[PDB]
Amino acid sequence: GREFGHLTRMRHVITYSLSPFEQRAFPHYFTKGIPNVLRRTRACILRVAPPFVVFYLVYTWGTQEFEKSKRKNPAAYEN
């Protein structure tokens, strides 16, 4: 009982629009795609990376240390 007749109430506003057949669908895709990514990646490259960055360190530390005490046990296997 919440179809397109009865919802919120609004007043004094206006909007315009064309058709699709009187326009082209590629307005400078090449020369506007790159700047958007350039401006937005900077903002959230800092918000997804640093949490993930402290796993590379612990993983490499553990891997190389275990490799030592598996491939180089005869170092401390003193005769």
């Binding site: 506003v13 206006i14 629009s17 699709p20 669908a25 598996k70 491939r71």
Partner: protein
């Protein structure tokens, strides 16, 4: 609490994405398997019908099964009688049962080589290494009387009395039979036996990309049409 020897990599002739199988190596590996090594494993899942499209021609193929005659099943007036053999039958087993196999070869069963390739961490490369790099045992290490030193084994020793070396066989095609070449032909045969759908796979995997890779750039365009009604509106306010 010990080490292991991870096999290297080789530029195998079938290693690519869009490559194939040399269909002359498998043919020559079949004789190697039969004459040299075909005693210690079962090869049960591979019948005599599976080589006609790979290695031999049919009238060339029937004469192989005839030589090895096997017991047949019970029937009236001559149950369990000998018979020449037919195409369908599976590769004749060497041994009666688990107990005789254990007794004859130091209580350790010999694995049946039908999934021996897929079930090894590594694969065809590890198989090629294990059959070349044997070495004499080091100093100060004890070993069993029936055990022979091998550095590719987790136990570093296995009951495999070396079965492969130079000029144990004769390649009928006119090839100077060196240990490396025969081992290579054997490995190329064995992987194919472990998974024959290689050659019929990489072709539909190619007639999938070309067809899709041009229909999908269509759907995009019909999309753009529809969503291009709504990205062109202006929205002003006047109280």
């Amino acid at each position: 609490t010990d080490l292991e020897l991870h096999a290297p990599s080789y530029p195998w002739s079938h290693r690519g994405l869009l490559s194939s199988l040399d269909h002359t190596s498998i043919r020559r590996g079949f004789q190697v398997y039969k004459q040299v090594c075909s005693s210690c494993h079962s090869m049960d899942y591979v019948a005599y019908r599976h080589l006609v499209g790979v290695c031999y021609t049919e009238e060339e193929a029937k004469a192989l099964a005839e030589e090895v005659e096997v017991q047949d099943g019970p029937n009236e007036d001559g149950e369990m009688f000998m018979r020449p053999g037919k195409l369908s039958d599976y590769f004749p087993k060497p041994y009666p049962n688990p107990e005789a196999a254990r007794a004859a070869n130091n209580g350790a069963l010999p694995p049946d080589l039908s999934y021996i390739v897929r079930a090894r961490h590594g694969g065809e490369d590890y198989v090629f290494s294990l059959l070349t790099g044997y070495c004499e045992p080091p100093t100060g290490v004890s070993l069993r009387e029936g055990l022979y030193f091998n550095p590719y084994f987790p136990g570093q020793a296995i009951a495999m009395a070396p079965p492969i070396y130079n000029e144990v066989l004769e390649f009928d095609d006119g090839t100077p039979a060196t240990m490396s070449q025969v081992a290579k032909d054997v490995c190329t045969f064995l992987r194919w036996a472990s998974e024959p759908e290689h050659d019929h796979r990489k072709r539909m995997g190619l007639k999938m990309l070309m067809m899709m890779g041009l229909l999908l750039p269509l759907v995009y365009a019909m999309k753009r049409h529809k969503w291009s009604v709504l990205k062109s509106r202006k929205l002003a306010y006047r109280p």
